[PDB]
Curated annotation (Swiss-Prot), chain A:
Belongs to the TUBGCP family. The chain holds residues 532 to 1817 of 1819 of the full protein. It is linked to Microcephaly and chorioretinopathy, autosomal recessive, 1: A syndrome characterized by microcephaly, cognitive impairment, underdeveloped retina and choroid, and epilepsy in some patients. The more anterior parts of the retina, near the periphery and pars plana, have a grayish hue and diminutive vasculature similar to retinopathy of prematurity. Visual impairment becomes evident during the first year of life. Component of the gamma-tubulin ring complex (gTuRC) consisting of TUBGCP2, TUBGCP3, TUBGCP4, TUBGCP5 and TUBGCP6 and gamma-tubulin TUBG1 or TUBG2. TUBGCP2, TUBGCP3, TUBGCP4, TUBGCP5 and TUBGCP6 assemble in a 5:5:2:1:1 stoichiometry; each is associated with a gamma-tubulin, thereby arranging 14 gamma-tubulins in a helical manner. Gamma-tubulin at the first position is blocked by TUBGCP3 at the last position, allowing 13 protafilaments to grow into a microtubule. The gene is TUBGCP6. Component of the gamma-tubulin ring complex (gTuRC) which mediates microtubule nucleation. The gTuRC regulates the minus-end nucleation of alpha-beta tubulin heterodimers that grow into microtubule protafilaments, a critical step in centrosome duplication and spindle formation. It is found in: Cytoplasm, Cytoskeleton, Microtubule organizing center, Centrosome. It comes from the Eukaryota. This is Gamma-tubulin complex component 6.
UniProtKB/Swiss-Prot annotation, chain C:
Signal peptide: none annotated. Ubiquitously expressed. Component of the gamma-tubulin ring complex (gTuRC) consisting of TUBGCP2, TUBGCP3, TUBGCP4, TUBGCP5 and TUBGCP6 and gamma-tubulin TUBG1 or TUBG2. TUBGCP2, TUBGCP3, TUBGCP4, TUBGCP5 and TUBGCP6 assemble in a 5:5:2:1:1 stoichiometry; each is associated with a gamma-tubulin, thereby arranging 14 gamma-tubulins in a helical manner. Gamma-tubulin at the first position is blocked by TUBGCP3 at the last position, allowing 13 protafilaments to grow into a microtubule. The modification Phosphotyrosine is found at Y75. This is Gamma-tubulin complex component 2. The gene is TUBGCP2. Belongs to the TUBGCP family. It is linked to Cortical dysplasia, complex, with other brain malformations 15: An autosomal recessive disorder characterized by global developmental delay, variably impaired intellectual development, speech delay, facial dysmorphism, microcephaly, and varying degrees of cortical malformations including pachygyria, thin corpus callosum and subcortical band heterotopia. Most patients have generalized seizures. It comes from Homo sapiens (Human). Component of the gamma-tubulin ring complex (gTuRC) which mediates microtubule nucleation. The gTuRC regulates the minus-end nucleation of alpha-beta tubulin heterodimers that grow into microtubule protafilaments, a critical step in centrosome duplication and spindle formation. Plays a role in neuronal migration. It is found in: Cytoplasm, Cytoskeleton, Microtubule organizing center, Centrosome. The chain holds residues 5 to 103 of 902 of the full protein.
Curated annotation (Swiss-Prot), chain D:
It is found in: Cytoplasm, Cytoskeleton, Microtubule organizing center, Centrosome; Cytoplasm, Cytoskeleton, Spindle. Associates with the gamma-tubulin ring complex (gTuRC) consisting of TUBGCP2, TUBGCP3, TUBGCP4, TUBGCP5 and TUBGCP6 and gamma-tubulin TUBG1 or TUBG2; within the complex, interacts with TUBGCP2; the interaction plays a role in gTuRC activation. It comes from Homo sapiens. Belongs to the MOZART2 family. It comes from the Eukaryota. This is Mitotic-spindle organizing protein 2A. The keyword Zinc does not apply. One of its GO terms (cellular component) is gamma-tubulin ring complex. The chain holds residues 35 to 80 of 158 of the full protein. Keywords: Cytoplasm, Cytoskeleton, Phosphoprotein. Required for the recruitment and the assembly of the gamma-tubulin ring complex (gTuRC) at the centrosome. The gTuRC regulates the minus-end nucleation of alpha-beta tubulin heterodimers that grow into microtubule protafilaments, a critical step in centrosome duplication and spindle formation.
Length: 436, 404, 95, 46, 35, 35
């Protein structure tokens, strides 16, 4: 077992024939990407559920296997800055009584120091041979839109083509979609750098039909970062699933920001070109849109806090703290889990996300009806040329009701449970009083 | 390992009892210059796959491909050698002495292409092919299909090759061959079996053969030079058919201008697709070819880079198309009539309000129907997508029978 | 390279879409020798104890033969766990 | 089959395959194939 | 179009490569006769 | 499972570069010997 330790700690191999050691190997070992690396290993922490405590302890048997991965498989994918093929200075094994159990382990325990060094010499492959977290910034730039000039070029192209109509799914063709993705990527101005490579679209059950105002309210517009093997130890399927989830949820928020442009452009569109005639439906309706834009924009500022520094700024020190692959994977999983939990998207806060949909749909379906119409009844301080002005008013009353309902509802979660981001929310959205 | 050493650092096969992993046979005579089929891996030079150890088999292709670079240009005129020489011997749990193989392979690659790229220079020599195919030595070809045009143009055989063989000298010296005298590789070739080898006269009149001596023959070989020998012929007919249509336009520099406008319009269908076919991707493929080959240096990738480059240049030319774009071939049968029958009419109009006109309606919706469906037929792509984008561009007749 | 005789014909020879995708699934690399076998796979013949002396004696003779093809037969010694899903077709084929 | 390692090894313990397919699988060991991939491609269709 | 017609055409183009492999299989066995 | 809508471009030029090459060439490996 001193030799078998060495084989798996100073080599990456394991001399075994009878199962005399608890290690294993698989057909997974012979392409060894992805989950297949998450499968090559050892059968349990023990053999069945017992172990020779004098050497494998049932304790540090894990950290043994951490360096086991670090020494076996880093060179296996690609010869490595501390191993070459296997030609770093050639391996050697290491490893009536007045200390009976007390210090058996203390003979073997300098192995754990070697392990801790191999561990410290595992972090660099991801920090530089990948530039992993520099790409996390790039991932935040593109997928989490902190490069707002990419994200607005994407929004401008995609939602200009979507606000042109094409309501029986007729925009969703591979070639136009790729052209806007590509074009948005060319217009990013950060450039298609090595970090800013690897970008692809996605969707599932591409809709042959759209709702009114063309929202894609079932958000089947998506973005993906193509993942390299050594990236794909720390990048992971559920992580990119949750990433594209928040991407699609913020992207429909960018569609509501685009709606914000469109409804304000409806003012500029006919410019109230009758310069000489002030209008009450102007002073009314151009203030109706003011609360709706103020509202969706304070929700925007709120969510921009909840992920892009409320959840990210802690991760900027949390990733710098750690020193293990599994800690790096786990800390990335913390960051993403808390991003879904704080950024409203979680299944537990979903009752409030339902009110968000109730607001969104109303603003979509009632300002499309403005977009396709002019400016109310003539007479007095007047606009002209739409009859449905009372329905534009009553839908704005329905919006206000759902904002009243929102305030009544959101208190409940922070009175029952414990979610500081929802206190933060209702502290903000009706800042000065019960409701304005 | 001493036998391996001789083969890795020199072009010498020591051959102990033929138990070493590489041996040489005299297959050289089967395909001496070009790799007409492969020779230098299993055949003339051969690897006995089981005679390699484990720690060397992981790169025994590079062992087999190191020494060849030291012993193919030794016959051609440079002493290709490795002054690096690191002795190979066993050691406990070590194979750094096999890690030396990469440096020696890359050095053999370096001295081989340090010949090939600049003595018998491929980066300047190879240009000859795509320069002379697809009429890119334009100052030759404008003279070529002009001085002897009257005995090249003819509808069914009836060329006189000796005339263009004298023009091949005058019109090349009159062109740019004065920039570099690289003419001798040009030889005329003609059809054994029509289209499919490519992978009427003036129409598709001829195409040009290409063979070279050994180090350039790593690059020029049968599977490639059959894309030489018989290509650009499916491009030559366009320039013939439009210039012959235009010779009708010479014979008249009443007069219902719809006929004149179709003469312009059907010609533009030739002219702008001819623009697309070759006046599209030009610089990039050369910029790629450099940074591909000049950095790599090693035939195991160099031939892949080159054969990739060759198809990349062709992918403008719808000469390369799996559907043969075959309605365009049917359209061609009336296109030639727009030349010959209307040349005949530019006598019989007195020997255009009538006998042109009675075919203008026919040519018009013969071309405009098939033209505005076949681009949609080729709607494959999501420098590319150029054939479709470039006759979408007009806006009227963007399509008439759509893909979607 | 030569996938006609041992991949295309072997895919066509099966008695049972993945008609052309089975060759891409079994896309072998000719430059490799990476067997996934181990010494633990030698006990696969112990389940077929109809005559286990002349079931255990064969492996040393096959190793003493000068062919290096005995290594990839670790999964092939276990073969199919379904009840005679390859072996019973020969009795139908012999008729 | 018609070989000492193709035919004798195919009927050692329990035995039994198609003979041509067994000869093709015995020849596949010399074709440098990964042991799991060809058996998985056979088992995903059979 | 329903995001399976295009991939069915792709699988047809894989079947084209399989047909070319079958033509290669007939070609490399006809090589032995007269040549 | 989910489809990224860009790999089909590479797949199209891959099948084009394999199949149209092989289709015309393999048949005219006859012509090299028959002609």
């Amino acid at each position: 077992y001193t030799r078998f330790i060495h084989d798996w700690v100073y080599s990456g191999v394991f001399r075994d024939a009878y199962g005399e050691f608890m290690i294993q190997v698989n057909h997974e070992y012979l392409s060894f990407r992805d989950k297949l690396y998450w499968t090559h290993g050892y059968v349990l922490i023990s053999k069945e559920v017992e172990d020779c405590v004098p050497v494998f302890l049932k304790h540090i048997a894990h950290d043994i296997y951490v360096c086991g991965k670090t020494i076996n498989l880093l060179k296996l994918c690609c010869p490595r800055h501390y191993l070459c093929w296997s030609d770093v200075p050639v391996p050697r094994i290491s490893v009536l009584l007045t200390l009976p159990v007390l210090m058996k382990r203390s003979i073997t325990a300098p192995l754990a120091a070697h392990i801790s060094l191999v561990n410290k010499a595992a972090v660099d492959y991801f920090f530089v041979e990948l530039h992993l977290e520099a790409h996390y910034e790039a991932l935040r730039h593109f997928l989490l839109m902190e490069d707002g000039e990419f994200a607005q070029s994407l929004s401008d192209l995609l939602f200009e083509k979507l606000g042109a109509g094409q309501t029986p799914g007729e925009l969703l063709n591979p070639l136009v979609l790729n052209s806007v993705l590509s074009k948005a990527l060319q217009c990013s101005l950060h450039g298609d750098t090595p970090h800013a490579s690897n970008l692809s679209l996605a969707l599932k059950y591409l809709p042959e039909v759209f709702a009114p105002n063309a929202p894609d309210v079932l958000s089947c517009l998506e973005l993906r970062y193509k993942v390299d093997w050594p990236l794909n130890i720390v990048i992971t399927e559920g992580c990119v699933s949750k990433y594209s989830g928040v991407f699609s949820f913020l992207l429909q928020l960018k569609l509501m920001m685009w709606a914000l442009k469109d409804v304000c452009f409806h003012l500029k569109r006919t410019a109230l070109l009758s310069h000489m005639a002030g209008s009450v439906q102007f002073r009314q309706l151009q203030l109706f849109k003011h609360e709706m834009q103020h509202f969706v924009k304070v929700i925007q500022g709120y969510i921009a806090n909840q992920i892009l520094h409320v959840t990210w700024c802690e991760f900027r020190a949390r990733l710098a703290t750690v020193g293990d692959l599994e800690e790096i994977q786990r800390a990335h999983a913390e960051y993403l889990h808390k991003a879904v939990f704080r950024g409203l998207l979680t299944e537990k806060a979903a009752p409030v996300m339902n009110v968000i949909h109730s607001i969104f749909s109303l603003v979509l379906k009632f300002r499309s009806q403005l977009i396709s119409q002019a400016w109310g009844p003539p007479g007095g301080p007047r606009g002209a040329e739409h009859p449905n002005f009372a329905l534009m008013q009553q839908s704005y009353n329905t919006f206000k009701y759902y904002s009243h309902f929102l305030f009544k509802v959101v208190t409940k979660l922070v009175n029952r449970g414990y979610q500081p981001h929802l206190e933060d929310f209702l502290l903000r959205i009706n800042f000065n009083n019960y409701y304005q | 390992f001493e036998v391996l050493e001789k083969w890795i650092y020199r072009g010498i096969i020591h051959d102990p009892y033929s138990e070493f992993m590489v041996e040489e046979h005299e297959l050289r005579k089967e395909r001496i210059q070009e790799d007409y089929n492969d020779k230098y891996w299993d055949q003339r030079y051969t690897i006995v796959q089981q005679q390699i150890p484990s720690f060397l088999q992981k790169m025994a292709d590079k062992i087999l491909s190191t020494g060849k670079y030291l012993n193919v240009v030794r016959e051609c005129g440079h002493d290709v050698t490795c002054p690096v020489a690191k002795e190979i011997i066993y050691t406990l749990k070590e194979r750094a002495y096999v890690e030396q193989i990469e440096k020696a392979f890359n050095y053999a690659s370096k001295v081989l292409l340090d010949f090939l790229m600049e003595e018998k220079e491929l980066v300047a020599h190879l240009r000859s092919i795509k320069r002379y195919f697809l009429m890119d030595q334009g100052d030759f070809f404008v003279h070529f299909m002009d001085l002897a045009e009257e005995e090249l143009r003819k509808p069914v055989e009836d060329i006189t090759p000796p005339r263009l063989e004298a023009l091949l000298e005058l019109a090349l010296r009159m062109s740019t061959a004065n920039t570099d005298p690289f003419k001798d590789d040009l030889k005329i070739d003609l059809m054994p079996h029509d289209l499919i080898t490519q992978l009427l006269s003036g129409l598709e009149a001829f195409s040009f053969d290409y063979i070279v001596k050994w180090p350039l023959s790593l690059i020029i070989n049968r599977k490639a030079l059959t894309r030489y020998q018989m290509l650009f012929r499916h491009m030559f007919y366009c320039k013939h058919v439009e210039r012959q249509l235009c010779s009708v336009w010479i014979s008249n520099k009443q007069w219902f201008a719809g006929a004149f406008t179709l003469r312009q319009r059907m010609l533009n269908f030739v002219q702008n697709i001819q623009y697309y076919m070759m006046f599209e991707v030009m610089e990039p493929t050369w910029h790629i070819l450099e940074k591909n080959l000049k950095s790599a240096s090693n035939i195991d990738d160099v031939l892949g880079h080159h054969t990739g480059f060759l198809d990349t240049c062709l992918k403008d030319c719808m000469l390369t198309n799996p559907e043969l774009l075959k309605v365009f071939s049917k359209l061609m049968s009336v296109c030639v009539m727009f030349t010959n029958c209307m040349q005949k009419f530019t006598q019989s109009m007195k020997l255009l309000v009538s006998g042109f006109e009675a075919t203008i309606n026919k040519f018009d919706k013969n071309f405009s129907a098939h033209l505005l469906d076949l681009l949609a037929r080729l709607s494959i792509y999501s420098g590319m997508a150029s054939v479709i984008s470039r006759l979408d561009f007009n806006g009227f007749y963007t399509e008439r029978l759509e893909r979607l | 390279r030569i996938h006609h005789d041992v991949n295309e014909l072997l895919s066509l020879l099966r008695v049972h879409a993945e008609v052309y995708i089975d060759l891409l699934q079994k896309n072998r690399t000719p430059y490799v020798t990476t067997t996934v076998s181990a010494h633990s796979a030698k006990v696969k013949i112990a389940e077929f104890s109809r005559t286990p002396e002349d079931f255990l004696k064969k492996y040393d003779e096959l190793k003493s033969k000068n062919t290096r093809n005995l290594d990839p037969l670790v999964y092939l010694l276990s073969k199919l766990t379904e009840d005679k899903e390859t072996l019973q077709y020969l009795q139908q084929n012999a008729k | 089959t018609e070989e000492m390692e193709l035919y004798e090894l195919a009927q050692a313990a329990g035995g039994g395959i198609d003979p041509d397919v067994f000869k093709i699988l015995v020849d596949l060991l010399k074709l440098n194939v990964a042991p799991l991939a060809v058996f998985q491609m056979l088992k995903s269709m059979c | 179009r329903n995001m399976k017609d295009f991939e069915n055409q792709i699988t047809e183009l894989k079947k084209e490569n399989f047909n070319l492999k079958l033509r290669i299989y007939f070609l490399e066995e006809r090589m032995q006769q007269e040549f």
